[PDB]
Design a protein around this ligand. Structure first.
Ligand SMILES: [Mn+2]
Ligand SMILES: [Mn+2]
Length: 711
């Protein structure tokens, strides 16, 4: 197996190193028969002897242009010949190139900014995390004392916890009568246990949580000070900070520092991403947090520290557990992409796709277009591309509603009309379809670079969804489940790619035509659904829509629906396809992205809607409409409220303005600052107006009523 790749310089020369993991062995391969490079497009290959002499001048030394044999590739489909001008060090590159696009004989230069080790795995076809070796996973978190003010690292490290598959400890330097804490004389020794531990344990992957930004550099700052090498890599070297997106990461030699944070912050969209926030969302249970309740430590070394311990063993076990979960996704994106996980982990899906293409461009012998200049890229931030539908809803309480899904509408549009910058209004094609409203024309005589790739992603995703339904090893099954969810994440992000400012394969027209092609099928389904099948369409949304037959009998609407889906697929082109998503006993659609519904089994989904006078009231409202089908009873419920408020009869309990009550807490040494737990309590025109009404008032526009009377 592979884990990583980087290069060292052994004097004026670059060397690739491979961290392989191999049958309980761990090691290093250095390869030195590999060299840096770029392409030059040329005026007349004849110059070749003129455009080699190009000198540089780096480090107080002379860069030059080593060996330069001629090659034949393809660009956007078109065969085209060019000059592979090789080099010596990948740093000879940033110093050579400008001299070259600035030479009269050269038209363009290409692939001039690919990091070396990345260029290495792609050109040699190597894929990281490939095997099926048992990686050793270890997670850890640390706990501090946020001093009176803010330096970062004046607060000692109160605790150091860690976790894995056998246990989860906490290492600390105070006394705590717990079976899973380990006490050690000082904070110097705490750090040492930790080091000795990663030594006995020796993990291949170390999992943290915002350890990039916190756990790791806190540790460092707090040792460049206490006289202790953070001997954490496998070559017995310390964690090292590395540049990435503008923010700043930590690679750890021989092991893989995988920082949960950057990874979660993607799949499931989330209000906040506190560990607790995250830990809940994915397996339910709950946690505990908002601190500086470290009083247990500070003078006032009162117990309760027993509490705090519990919490560290927690920060970890949680961290470990999400890691085990969110990790296979990333192992897989790394695998599809052909790059390394400390890397893969830290890049937008936008980017994973780009490496997905640099790699599929080498494999099929196609020069990669260059990234955008600052200017071409300045434009792009120019907006408004164009995304499909959202038309307004047939208002009203409806019942026996049916929801119809498009099986991956965009990956499907792209594949079917061969939408691609490289098929785009290409000259003299003989076969071609035309983008609905904007006339862009995508040729059809030849697959299209992204279309064939996408088609192949979708085709391998079916071989996995299919093999699963067949498998009894539950190990193979979850693993396959992983392969698929990744291909899926990836296949689904090409749309946005086309729209990406920095995509090398930018093509806003490819993006407009999909969106637009998107509108035409929706409609069509919408027509057909209403005309040929007598349904009233209730509300369309970018991939699908809700429908029914007013007053219609319910296990008929289902069956007419079922029926209509097989009617339509036969009318839809290539691989466009609708599917039957769900049946909801009732629902109503206020407007654009506000609406609600409940299924045959009492569950309520609502997006766009949702104090405790409102909370309790907006919900009684909801029950009545959904569960008991009644609009009156609920106004009948806003009323018996707008009136217990102007009558004044409701527990002083459902109310829990800012700033304002660090107005009495000022006695308790309660030196509150914008980061201290506070679940604090706080008109008539209020409660009824700034409060109750707006929260029951959106739902209701939906039936026309209005604040007045309501009052
Ligand atoms: Mn790496
Ligand atoms: Mn923590």
């Amino acid at each position: 197996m592979i884990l990583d790749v980087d290069y060292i310089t052994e004097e004026g020369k670059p060397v690739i190193r491979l961290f392989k993991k191999e049958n309980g062995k761990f090691k290093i391969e250095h390869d030195r028969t590999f060299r840096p490079y770029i392409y030059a497009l040329l005026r007349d290959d004849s110059k070749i002897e003129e455009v080699k002499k190009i000198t540089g001048e780096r480090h107080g030394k002379i860069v030059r242009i080593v060996d330069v044999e001629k090659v034949e590739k393809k660009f956007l489909g078109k065969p085209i010949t060019v000059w592979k001008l090789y080099l010596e060090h990948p740093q000879d590159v940033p110093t050579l190139r400008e001299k070259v696009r600035e030479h009269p004989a050269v038209v363009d230069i290409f692939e001039y900014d690919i990091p070396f080790a990345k260029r290495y795995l792609i050109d040699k076809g190597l894929i990281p995390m490939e095997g099926e070796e048992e990686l050793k996973i270890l997670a850890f978190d640390i706990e501090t004392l946020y001093h009176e003010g803010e330096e970062f690292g004046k607060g000692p490290i109160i605790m150091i916890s860690y976790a894995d598959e056998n246990e989860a400890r906490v290492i600390t330097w105070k006394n705590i009568d717990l079976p899973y804490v380990e006490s050690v004389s000082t904070e110097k020794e705490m750090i040492k246990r930790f080091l000795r531990i990663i030594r006995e344990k020796d993990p291949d992957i170390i999992v943290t949580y915002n350890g990039d930004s916190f756990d790791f550099p806190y540790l460092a700052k707090r040792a460049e000070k206490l006289g202790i090498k953070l001997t954490i890599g496998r070559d017995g070297s310390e964690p090292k900070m590395q540049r990435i997106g503008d923010m700043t990461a930590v690679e750890v030699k021989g092991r893989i520092h995988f920082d949960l944070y950057h990874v979660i912050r993607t799949t499931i969209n989330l209000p906040t991403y506190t560990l607790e926030a995250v830990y809940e969302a994915i397996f339910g249970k709950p946690k505990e947090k908002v601190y500086a309740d470290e009083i247990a430590k500070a003078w006032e070394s009162g117990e309760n520290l027993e509490r705090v311990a519990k919490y560290s063993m927690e920060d970890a076990k949680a961290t470990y557990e999400l890691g085990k979960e969110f990790l296979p996704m990333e192992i897989q994106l790394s695998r599809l992409v052909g790059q390394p996980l400390w890397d893969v982990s830290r890049s937008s899906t936008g980017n994973l796709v780009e490496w997905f293409l640099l790699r599929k461009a080498y494999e099929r012998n196609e020069v990669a277009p260059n990234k955008p200049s600052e200017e071409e890229y300045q434009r792009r931030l120019r907006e408004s591309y164009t995304g499909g539908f959202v038309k307004e809803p047939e208002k009203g309480l409806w019942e026996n509603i049916v929801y119809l899904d498009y099986k991956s509408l965009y990956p499907s549009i792209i594949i079917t009309h061969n939408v691609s910058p490289d098929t785009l209004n290409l000259e003299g094609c003989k076969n071609y379809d035309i983008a609905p409203q904007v006339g862009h024309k995508f040729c059809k005589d030849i697959p299209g670079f992204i279309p064939s790739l996408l088609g192949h992603l979708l085709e391998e995703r079916q071989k996995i969804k299919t093999k699963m339904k067949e498998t009894q090893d539950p190990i193979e099954k979850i693993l396959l489940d992983y392969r698929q969810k990744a291909i899926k994440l990836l296949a689904n992000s090409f749309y946005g790619y086309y729209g990406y400012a920095k995509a090398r394969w930018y093509c806003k027209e490819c993006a407009e035509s999909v969106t637009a092609w998107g509108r035409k099928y929706i409609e069509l389904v919408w027509k057909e659904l209403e005309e040929k099948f007598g349904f009233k369409v209730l509300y369309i949304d970018t991939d699908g829509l809700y429908a029914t037959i007013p007053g219609g009998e319910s296990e008929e609407i289902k069956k007419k629906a079922l029926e209509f889906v097989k009617y339509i697929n036969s009318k839809l082109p290539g691989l466009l396809e609708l599917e039957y998503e769900g049946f909801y006993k009732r629902g109503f659609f206020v407007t654009k992205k506000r609406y609600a519904v409940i299924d045959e089994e009492g569950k309520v989904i609502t997006r766009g809607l949702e104090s405790e006078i409102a909370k309790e009231t907006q919900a009684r409202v909801l029950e009545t409409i959904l569960k008991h089908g009644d609009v009156e009873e609920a106004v009948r419920i806003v009323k018996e409220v707008i009136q217990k408020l102007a009558n004044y009869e409701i527990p002083p309990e459902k109310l829990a303005p800012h700033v304002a009550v660090a107005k009495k807490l000022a006695a308790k040494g309660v030196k509150i600052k914008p980061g201290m737990v506070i679940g604090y309590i706080v008109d008539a025109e209020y409660y009824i107006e700034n409060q109750v009404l707006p929260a029951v008032l959106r739902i209701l526009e939906g039936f026309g009523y209005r604040k007045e009377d309501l009052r």
